[PDB]
Amino acid sequence: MRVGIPTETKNNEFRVAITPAGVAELTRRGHEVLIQAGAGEGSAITDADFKAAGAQLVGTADQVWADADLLLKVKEPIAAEYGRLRHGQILFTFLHLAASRACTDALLDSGTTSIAYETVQTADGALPLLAPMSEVAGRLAAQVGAYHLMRTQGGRGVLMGGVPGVEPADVVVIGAGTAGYNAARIANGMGATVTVLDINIDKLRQLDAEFCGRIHTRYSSAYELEGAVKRADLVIGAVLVPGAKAPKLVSNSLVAHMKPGAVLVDIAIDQGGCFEGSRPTTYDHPTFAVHDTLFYCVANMPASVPKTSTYALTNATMPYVLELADHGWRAACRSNPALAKGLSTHEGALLSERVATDLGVPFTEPASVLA
């Protein structure tokens, strides 16, 4: 058994799918760990750090993919990587197959076995590998929203927390899930007057207790959302629905009635976004205009703080990585139903019903390959 970790190849993808701690634990259990030279540098992990932990440093991506029985990544394989996919390999990474027929087809045709980080799901319904990325994105949303509120960024020119005697930014967070909770928490810590909207009153009750009412909570009726958004300096869209696409909760018509220079940060942009006018941008020109407002729609936000997010992710993936390495995909999935819910492809079979219907291709019951 060799576990291989290649360098991430997507635009501004600085994260890596393992850290020296994880390398140490794998090598201690008798597994070889092959890591592409430079793979951790985006995350401030040097080749020397990885080697001291037991990793075999490999000069090329091609050798990692060729030699590895278990291949750990952060993002989905891109076109340039399709020719590296292999029948006898297990790939464990964020896949988002519903968003790519091409990626889905590449995995099936290769016959490879793949497990998606984002559909690994515990009995209580939680998504333990997606969770830390939602936490990072939410906290990032507050700090990037604060920055783009500066007049020198085209924003309204409002300081998050005000100063004594002067109004703070009015911040509206749409969605009180993991991402939204974390956005409201940081925005609140910066001094902003934060209102969180959700249709799940239990989540609002949780926010109300945690901050003793300092974070305002409003039931998200259409009337309430319009009114709050109209008054906001900063709107953070954090309604991320697990699976298919995000609802368009904020219309361009509504945007036209917003304060000039208001900033809208969509952290559901990887699901088409929850604003109507949202188009996925990137760090080069992260913002565009919509009716005198500024939209921030950068996809893959956690990639911008890789030192943090590499650890957040791999801390969460570690026990699954160890199970897969120790026991192989089938035994691991048989023993751990949370991991089985991530099973995506195997030997040309597509194993996600939700992915299959969204693409309109056949689905093979996961039970048929596990039992």
Ligand X SMILES: CNc1ncnc2c1ncn2[C@@H]1O[C@H](CO)[C@@H](O)[C@H]1O
Indicate which residues carry an active-site annotation: 96, 270
Residue 242 tokens, joined: 């697990």
User: Taking CB under 6 A as the criterion, which residues in 209-238 touch ligand X?
Assistant: 220, 225
Q: How far is the CB of 359 from ligand X (least distance, A)?
A: 23
Using DSSP, state whether 339 is helix, strand or coil: helix
Inter-residue contact 93 to 65 (CB < 8 Å): no
- Pick the piece of the chain touching ligand X (CB under 6 A) from 97-105, 118-126, 199-207, 325-333: 199-207
- Residue 317 is a binding residue for ligand X (CB under 6 A): no
Nearer to ligand X, 23 or 232 (CB): 232
Assigned token pair, 69: 């029985």
Comparing CB distances to ligand X, the nearer of 198 and 233 is: 198
**Residue 82 to residues 65, 95, 108, 109, Cα–Cα distance (Å):** 11, 13, 11, 10
Torsion, CA 44, CA 49, CA 51, CA 55, rounded to 10: -60
Binder of ligand X out of 2, 10, 51, 203 (CB under 6 A): 203
Among 45, 68, 131, 176, binds ligand X (CB under 6 A): 176
Rule CB under 6 A: is residue 184 a binding residue for ligand X?
A: no
Nearest CB to ligand X, comparing residues 35 and 228: 228
Tell me which DSSP letter residue 216 carries.
E
Nearer to ligand X, 72 or 225 (CB): 225
CA-wise closest residue to 187 among 94, 102, 263: 263
Nearer to ligand X, 174 or 265 (CB): 174
Residues 237-256 that bind ligand X (CB under 6 A): 239-241, 249
Counting contacts by CB under 6 A, is residue 303 touching ligand X?
Answer: no
What is 178-200 written as a DSSP string?
A: HHHHHHHHHHHHTT-EEEEEES-
* 175 touches ligand X by CB under 6 A: yes
Residue 200 makes contact with ligand X by CB under 6 A: yes
Three-state DSSP at 281 gives strand
Tokens encoding 222: 């259409």
- Residue 199, interface with ligand X (CB under 6 A)? yes
**183 touching ligand X, by CB under 6 A:** no
Strands 193-198 and 170-174: parallel
Task: Report the interface residues with ligand X, using CB under 6 A.
Answer: 174-177, 197-200, 203, 220, 225, 239-241, 249
